[PDB]
Design an enzyme around this catalytic site. Structure first.
Site, PDB file in Angstrom:
ATOM      1  N   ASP A  49      -4.327 -78.113  92.253  1.00  0.00           N
ATOM      2  CA  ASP A  49      -3.438 -78.658  93.268  1.00  0.00           C
ATOM      3  C   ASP A  49      -2.431 -77.610  93.725  1.00  0.00           C
ATOM      4  OD1 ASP A  49      -1.230 -78.727  91.269  1.00  0.00           O
ATOM      5  OD2 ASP A  49      -0.986 -80.879  91.435  1.00  0.00           O
ATOM      6  N   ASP A  85       1.776 -77.441  94.522  1.00  0.00           N
ATOM      7  CA  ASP A  85       3.035 -78.163  94.316  1.00  0.00           C
ATOM      8  C   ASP A  85       4.172 -77.510  95.052  1.00  0.00           C
ATOM      9  OD1 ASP A  85       1.536 -79.729  92.418  1.00  0.00           O
ATOM     10  OD2 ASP A  85       2.109 -78.351  90.839  1.00  0.00           O
ATOM     11  N   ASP A 122       1.314 -81.994  95.729  1.00  0.00           N
ATOM     12  CA  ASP A 122       2.442 -82.764  95.213  1.00  0.00           C
ATOM     13  C   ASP A 122       3.725 -82.255  95.804  1.00  0.00           C
ATOM     14  OD1 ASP A 122       0.586 -84.088  93.498  1.00  0.00           O
ATOM     15  OD2 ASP A 122       0.921 -82.553  91.968  1.00  0.00           O
TER      16      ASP A 122
HETATM   17  N1  LIG Z   1       5.283 -85.529  86.501  1.00  0.00           N
HETATM   18  C1  LIG Z   1       6.018 -84.415  86.085  1.00  0.00           C
HETATM   19  N2  LIG Z   1       7.288 -84.460  85.582  1.00  0.00           N
HETATM   20  C2  LIG Z   1       7.931 -83.328  85.209  1.00  0.00           C
HETATM   21  N3  LIG Z   1       7.382 -82.096  85.299  1.00  0.00           N
HETATM   22  C3  LIG Z   1       6.123 -81.959  85.788  1.00  0.00           C
HETATM   23  C4  LIG Z   1       5.396 -83.145  86.199  1.00  0.00           C
HETATM   24  N4  LIG Z   1       4.177 -82.774  86.651  1.00  0.00           N
HETATM   25  C5  LIG Z   1       4.109 -81.497  86.545  1.00  0.00           C
HETATM   26  N5  LIG Z   1       5.247 -80.926  86.027  1.00  0.00           N
HETATM   27  C6  LIG Z   1       5.406 -79.495  85.805  1.00  0.00           C
HETATM   28  O1  LIG Z   1       5.098 -78.920  87.104  1.00  0.00           O
HETATM   29  C7  LIG Z   1       3.868 -78.156  87.065  1.00  0.00           C
HETATM   30  C8  LIG Z   1       2.692 -78.615  87.987  1.00  0.00           C
HETATM   31  O2  LIG Z   1       2.098 -79.959  87.920  1.00  0.00           O
HETATM   32  P1  LIG Z   1       0.509 -79.841  87.571  1.00  0.00           P
HETATM   33  O3  LIG Z   1      -0.255 -79.451  88.910  1.00  0.00           O
HETATM   34  O4  LIG Z   1       0.074 -81.198  87.127  1.00  0.00           O
HETATM   35  C9  LIG Z   1       0.110 -78.503  86.273  1.00  0.00           C
HETATM   36  P2  LIG Z   1       0.015 -76.619  86.537  1.00  0.00           P
HETATM   37  O5  LIG Z   1      -0.620 -75.858  85.251  1.00  0.00           O
HETATM   38  O6  LIG Z   1       1.363 -76.011  86.619  1.00  0.00           O
HETATM   39  O7  LIG Z   1      -0.823 -76.279  87.951  1.00  0.00           O
HETATM   40  P3  LIG Z   1      -2.476 -75.968  88.069  1.00  0.00           P
HETATM   41  O8  LIG Z   1      -3.268 -77.249  88.660  1.00  0.00           O
HETATM   42  O9  LIG Z   1      -2.605 -74.801  88.979  1.00  0.00           O
HETATM   43  O10 LIG Z   1      -3.212 -75.567  86.692  1.00  0.00           O
HETATM   44  C10 LIG Z   1       3.481 -77.945  85.596  1.00  0.00           C
HETATM   45  O11 LIG Z   1       3.657 -76.596  85.154  1.00  0.00           O
HETATM   46  C11 LIG Z   1       4.283 -79.015  84.849  1.00  0.00           C
HETATM   47  O12 LIG Z   1       4.621 -78.610  83.532  1.00  0.00           O
HETATM   48 MG   LIG Z   2       0.212 -77.009  89.753  1.00  0.00          MG
HETATM   49 ZN   LIG Z   3       0.895 -80.899  90.754  1.00  0.00          ZN
END
Ligand SMILES: Nc1ncnc2c1ncn2[C@@H]1O[C@H](COP(=O)(O)CP(=O)(O)OP(=O)(O)O)[C@@H](O)[C@H]1O
Ligand SMILES: [Mg+2]
Ligand SMILES: [Zn+2]
Ligand code: NA
Ligand SMILES: [Zn+2]
Length: 340
Positions: free
Chosen positions: A195, A197, A264
């Site tokens: 995803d 963010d 997101d």
């Molecule tokens: N619902 C939530 N509440 C608080 N912190 C959150 C969260 N969701 C995500 N985070 C933090 O924000 C980041 C991104 O959300 P995610 O896409 O679910 C994991 P990612 O490893 O960082 O990205 P990726 O899909 O490239 O592997 C993460 O590093 C996570 O620790």
């Molecule tokens: Mg992410």
């Molecule tokens: Zn995310």
């Protein structure tokens, strides 16, 4: 001396121990699926510390002085040194419950409870789940199945940047002073992700303007025919989990001419932007250790919204991540060094 805390280590994407950490990551994932929190945490901490090493482990002597390496973990490292493979991780990869849980939760909208329900019904493939005449799916799962192939293919940097343009264009239409920052893996230097963010904040927006922005931006995209899925539902900040239609012409790096992308968006009050940025940049293990260090070593309470000092009985203010690290008594760790 290597610290037991990821927030006191520099972890870059040049992993010299991928043979060990890939195996430890599989074992940790299986323990998460089996709801074994303790064994999951032990494998995650071991994997994390090895990711920080500036050299590859080539003998058991090389593990001396490294923290978070228990007897179970050392048996796994010893086995990989022995024949280049983990027999334990190989058994997990061939386990029917592990295979099913990985496969079912790879669908957007499917969590541990639904995956467990389908497994106990005898389902093993997504084809048999989708074509079943008795099963009833949530609106999230329907989108998860409809855009499955696009969502399961990884998002690259030209696609992430094309999404950033779309987000910024929409946001500045309603809040021209808004600051839009790409967070997550891509902010830590990763080439791919599942995803994209973003953290959105505005220095002059009112409480009501702040509340209405995600509704305005998603309605704008709905009108443009780009909103494939939208959930504006909750950290405690206002956020939305979306699926956007990304036209191939927008990507500067064949098929249907577009790709479904998981996006997101997080809206936070301007004064909490450093705490939110820090929490959404990650990695998950870096965040867990930051919060654990704050509690156990500084008697401070940290989350995505604030930093509280239990001794001084005051909230600590920060305009940047650097100021948060300084309050905690930590040397600043760059985003690309947070890949714990
Ligand atoms: N619902 C939530 N509440 C608080 N912190 C959150 C969260 N969701 C995500 N985070 C933090 O924000 C980041 C991104 O959300 P995610 O896409 O679910 C994991 P990612 O490893 O960082 O990205 P990726 O899909 O490239 O592997 C993460 O590093 C996570 O620790
Ligand atoms: Mg992410
Ligand atoms: Zn995310
Ligand atoms: Na899922
Ligand atoms: Zn909070």
């Amino acid at each position: 001396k290597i610290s037991q805390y990821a927030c006191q280590r520099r972890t870059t994407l040049n992993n010299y121990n991928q043979l060990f950490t890939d195996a430890l990551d599989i074992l940790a994932e299986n323990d998460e699926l089996r709801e074994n929190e303790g064994s999951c945490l032990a494998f995650m901490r071991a994997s994390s510390v090895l990711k920080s090493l500036p050299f590859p482990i080539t003998s058991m002597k090389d593990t001396e002085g490294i923290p978070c390496l228990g007897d179970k973990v050392k048996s796994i490292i010893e086995g990989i040194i022995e024949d280049g493979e983990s027999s334990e991780a190989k058994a997990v990869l061939n386990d029917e419950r592990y295979k099913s849980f990985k496969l079912f939760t790879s669908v957007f909208g499917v969590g541990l409870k639904t995956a467990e329900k389908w497994f106990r019904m005898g389902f093993r493939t997504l084809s048999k789940i989708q074509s079943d005449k008795s099963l009833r799916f949530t609106q999230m799962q329907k989108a998860g199945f409809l855009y499955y192939e696009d969502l399961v293919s990884c998002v690259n940097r030209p696609e992430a940047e094309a999404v950033s343009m779309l987000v910024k264009e929409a946001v500045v239409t309603f809040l021209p002073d808004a600051l839009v920052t790409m967070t997550g893996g891509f902010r830590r230097g990763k080439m791919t992700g599942h995803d994209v963010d973003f953290l959105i904040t505005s220095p002059e927006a009112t409480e009501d303007e702040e509340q209405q922005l995600l509704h305005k931006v998603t309605d704008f995209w709905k009108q443009q025919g780009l909103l494939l899925y939208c959930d504006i539902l909750e950290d405690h900040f206002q956020k939305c989990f979306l699926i956007l239609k990304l036209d191939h012409g927008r990507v500067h790096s064949e098929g249907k001419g577009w790709k479904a992308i998981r996006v997101d968006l997080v809206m936070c009050p301007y004064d909490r932007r450093a705490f939110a940025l820090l929490g959404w940049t990650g990695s998950r293990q870096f965040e867990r250790d930051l919060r654990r260090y704050a509690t156990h070593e500084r008697k401070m309470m940290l989350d995505n919204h604030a930093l509280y000092d239990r001794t001084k009985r005051v909230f600590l203010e920060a305009e940047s991540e650097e100021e948060i690290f300084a309050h905690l008594g930590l040397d600043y760790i760059e985003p690309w060094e947070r890949n714990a």
